[PDB]
Amino acid sequence: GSELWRQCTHWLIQCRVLPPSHRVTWDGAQVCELAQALRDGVLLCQLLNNLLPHAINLREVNLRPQMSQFLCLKNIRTFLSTCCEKFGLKRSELFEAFDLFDVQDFGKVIYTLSALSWTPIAQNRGIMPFPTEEDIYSGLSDQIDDTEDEDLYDCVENEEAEGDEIYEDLMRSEPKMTEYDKRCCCLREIQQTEEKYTDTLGSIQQHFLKPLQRFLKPQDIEIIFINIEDLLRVHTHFLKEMKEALGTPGAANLYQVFIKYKERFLVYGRYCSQVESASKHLDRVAAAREDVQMKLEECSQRANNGRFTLRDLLMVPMQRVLKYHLLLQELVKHTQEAMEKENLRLALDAMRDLAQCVNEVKRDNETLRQITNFQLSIENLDQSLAHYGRPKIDGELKITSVERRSKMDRYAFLLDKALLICKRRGDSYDLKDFVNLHSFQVRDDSSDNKKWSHMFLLIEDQGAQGYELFFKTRELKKKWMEQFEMAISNIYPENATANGHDFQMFSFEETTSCKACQMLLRGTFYQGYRCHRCRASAHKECLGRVPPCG
Numbered sequence: 001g002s003e004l005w006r007q008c009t010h011w012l013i014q015c016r017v018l019p020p021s022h023r024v025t026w027d028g029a030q031v032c033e034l035a036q037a038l039r040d041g042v043l044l045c046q047l048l049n050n051l052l053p054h055a056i057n058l059r060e061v062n063l064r065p066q067m068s069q070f071l072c073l074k075n076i077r078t079f080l081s082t083c084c085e086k087f088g089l090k091r092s093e094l095f096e097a098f099d100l101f102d103v104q105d106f107g108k109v110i111y112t113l114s115a116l117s118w119t120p121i122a123q124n125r126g127i128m129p130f131p132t133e134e135d136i137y138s139g140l141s142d143q144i145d146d147t148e149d150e151d152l153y154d155c156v157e158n159e160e161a162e163g164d165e166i167y168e169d170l171m172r173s174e175p176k177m178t179e180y181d182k183r184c185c186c187l188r189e190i191q192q193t194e195e196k197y198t199d200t201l202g203s204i205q206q207h208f209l210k211p212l213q214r215f216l217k218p219q220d221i222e223i224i225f226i227n228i229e230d231l232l233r234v235h236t237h238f239l240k241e242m243k244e245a246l247g248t249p250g251a252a253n254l255y256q257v258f259i260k261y262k263e264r265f266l267v268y269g270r271y272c273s274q275v276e277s278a279s280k281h282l283d284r285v286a287a288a289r290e291d292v293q294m295k296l297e298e299c300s301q302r303a304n305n306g307r308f309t310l311r312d313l314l315m316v317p318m319q320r321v322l323k324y325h326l327l328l329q330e331l332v333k334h335t336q337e338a339m340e341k342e343n344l345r346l347a348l349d350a351m352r353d354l355a356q357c358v359n360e361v362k363r364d365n366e367t368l369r370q371i372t373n374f375q376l377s378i379e380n381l382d383q384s385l386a387h388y389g390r391p392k393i394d395g396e397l398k399i400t401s402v403e404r405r406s407k408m409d410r411y412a413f414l415l416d417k418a419l420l421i422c423k424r425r426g427d428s429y430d431l432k433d434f435v436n437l438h439s440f441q442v443r444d445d446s447s448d449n450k451k452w453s454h455m456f457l458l459i460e461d462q463g464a465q466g467y468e469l470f471f472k473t474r475e476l477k478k479k480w481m482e483q484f485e486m487a488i489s490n491i492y493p494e495n496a497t498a499n500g501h502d503f504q505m506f507s508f509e510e511t512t513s514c515k516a517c518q519m520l521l522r523g524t525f526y527q528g529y530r531c532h533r534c535r536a537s538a539h540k541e542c543l544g545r546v547p548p549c550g
């Protein structure tokens with residue numbers, strides 16, 4: 001007998017889609033909060049996965065589509081497509097992507113979730129459908145833009161979950177006391193998981209790599225396996241040197257093994273950057289060749305008795321390097337001697353930085369996936385989008401010239417170095433104007449609260465050409481103007497031109513270190529800045545601390 005959207009919320013909490021502590025759950029919550037929570041299609045996609053195992057492959061979901069209408073619509077459509085394919089819903093029971101994204105018909109989205117709650121697939125899973133037996137969605141268009149909600153995704157599967165299962169299934173150690181005894185439990189775990197790790201590396205080389213060489217070209221082996229044989233080397237040595245440190249009573253040398261191997265573990269950059277490319281190539285040679293497909297089964301049978309496939313095993317190196325800081329965090333907790341706790345604290349710092357190095361590669365690999373998708377959907381685009389930096393924001397806007405008065409309804413893609421003025425042809429987008437942001441600057445003019453009256457300007461440094469940018473709400477103007485400020489700030493960062501330097505956004509392809517903080521320029525895409533004059537490379541926040549140019 002409660003309003004239908006409140007029933008939907010309760011069904012969503014039951015499907016483990018919404019955190020029970022979420023504001024949407026609370027008394028007094030407005031229907032707009034449910035629309036904001038479902039808008040980007042992430043929870044909706046998770047909802048189908050919670051009802052049906054592998055209804056949606058995580059690689060098909062954009063897990064954080066913050067400022068991208070493009071990524072949001074892809075998610076909503078995936079959710080919608082899976083609904084008729086795997087849940088057997090009719091097109092009449094389904095809503096159109098904009099009924100949710102631009103809250104054109106929110107009731108329809110609720111009806112669809114009700115149809116979904118009433119499907120057997122869900123009914124059987126123990127979950128109570130809804131309803132058991134007015135007009136509040138009309139003002140939704142006006143309220144849809146409101147606050148980044150980090151906590152909204154608490155019930156969403158991480159990208160690294162699949163890999164963490166395979167890792168823990170393998171590293172599974174056999175199963176109160178004092179701090180020293182607990183400290184010894186940590187040391188034992190560090191060695192036991194490392195031994196299994198080095199053997200797992202060995203298993204990949206011996207039962208997969210070497211036997212597959214008879215089936216695959218050296219080219220295919222390089223793509224699929226990368227530097228697994230080099231990782232085996234580093235670890236075979238790391239294992240020997242770590243055991244020596246654990247061999248001497250007291251293990252007050254252990255931390256130095258970690259430090260020495262921090263630079264040696266840089267070989268992971270190569271592994272992390274090519275791992276997904278490897279997986280897709282492995283998946284294709286396997287799908288095309290029945291002989292390779294059968295050999296992989298035999299390799300899996302002879303190595304672990306069908307427990308792990310090669311595809312699962314190749315996810316293990318990224319997981320191991322993420323665990324080092326966790327195994328050291330627990331050890332340092334149970335280390336109650338001032339110098340030894342501080343020595344291991346330095347090793348922990350070195351392993352946390354390696355965990356950040358991992359995550360930077362992952363982020364940049366996700367950014368490239370986004371860029372290549374933008375590229376395919378954008379027509380009349382001659383330029384390669386990867387030369388223009390990171391995507392900042394994308395969606396509909398209204399535009400005119402500085403002198404002109406009549407506004408044109410356009411679609412825009414903002415990246416660090418460029419603004420792409422488009423007009424969509426259904427799903428594809430026509431590039432009408434490619435604005436290079438190098439010569440432009442943002443100017444806001446206060447002169448309100450009328451749809452599309454919220455405007456700022458894009459003015460050229462030569463005063464040559466201009467643009468008046470109009471947005472539906474004051475919230476959308478705020479969102480867009482902040483991203484333009486962020487973009488322009490990345491083009492001309494603080495201290496870019498200091499001490500004779502000409503620091504510009506640069507995408508390093510070779511392993512470079514910051515000339516100021518000595519730390520790695522982490523990642524594979526626009527990692528930082530370069531001065532063409534003295535060839536100095538730095539982090540955005542480090543430009544001040546760089547010695548002068550010549």
Ligand SMILES: CCS(=O)(=O)N1CCC[C@@H](C[C@@H](CO)Nc2nccn3c(-c4ccc(C)cc4)cnc23)C1
Binds near residue numbers: 268511
């Ligand atoms: C030279 C060959 S390459 O393969 O290394 N090569 C590829 C193309 C991209 C290159 C860009 C450089 C820029 O500085 N980044 C890294 N190099 C080494 C390592 N890395 C990490 C890293 C380090 C440790 C761990 C555990 C995980 C990740 C992150 N980021 C880089 C690098």
Ligand SMILES: [Zn+2]
Binds near residue numbers: 502533
């Ligand atoms: Zn310089």
Ligand SMILES: [Zn+2]
Binds near residue numbers: 514541
């Ligand atoms: Zn730096």
